[PDB]
């Protein structure tokens, strides 16, 4: 009845403000290491937060900004990585967005409540910190026109790796 220690940083530089991802490379070292060198490759820079359900989630990563594209580092969809201490519990989580099982690319998404019925199904690889929940929770601010797309969606400007856990990433050219 207590989450594991985290081990790794992100901030994500976005247009509702900075958001801080502590994360767990440990319990999901293929997902974290993903996500850790797409913000090196700057692969996630100038890319719009293009899915808001309301009380559920705010979705992005997607370099196209359609909702259907992003590729993962690895040349194809890479597998689940579930941990029981790791739950959809409380809102500002980090996980990977998927349509299947071992269908992880670079999509991702943050919780904005609980989202139990996600449990086993979702990788989850990280949580926002405490002093940048506000603006993590300010990209579902927005006025959404159809499919759950915002008229005017956020976006990710850039990104920093503030604590790389990982000795041997190689951001590709």
């Known amino acids: 009845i207590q989450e594991p220690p985290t081990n790794g940083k992100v901030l994500?530089?976005?247009?509702?403000?900075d958001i801080d991802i502590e994360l767990w490379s440990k319990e999901a070292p293929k997902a974290c290491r993903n996500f850790i060198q797409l913000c090196l490759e700057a692969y996630y820079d100038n890319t719009i937060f293009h899915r808001v359900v309301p009380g559920f989630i705010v979705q992005g990563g997607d370099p196209t900004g359609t909702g259907s594209?992003?590729?993962?580092?690895?040349?194809?969809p890479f597998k689940d990585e579930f941990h029981s201490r790791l739950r959809f519990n409380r809102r500002g989580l980090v996980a990977m967005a998927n349509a299947g099982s071992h269908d992880n690319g670079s999509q991702f998404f943050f919780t904005l409540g609980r989202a139990d019925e996600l449990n086993n199904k979702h990788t989850i690889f990280?949580?926002?910190?405490?002093?940048?929940?506000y603006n993590m929770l300010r990209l579902s601010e927005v006025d959404i026109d159809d499919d759950e797309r915002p008229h005017n969606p956020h976006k990710i400007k850039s990104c920093e790796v503030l604590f790389n856990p990982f000795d041997d990433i190689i951001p590709r050219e």
Not at 126 to 133: A, L, Q, S
């Open 12 to 17: 994500l530089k976005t247009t509702a403000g």
């Open 69 to 76: 594209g992003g590729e993962s580092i690895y040349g194809a």
């Open 126 to 133: 990280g949580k926002v910190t405490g002093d940048t929940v």
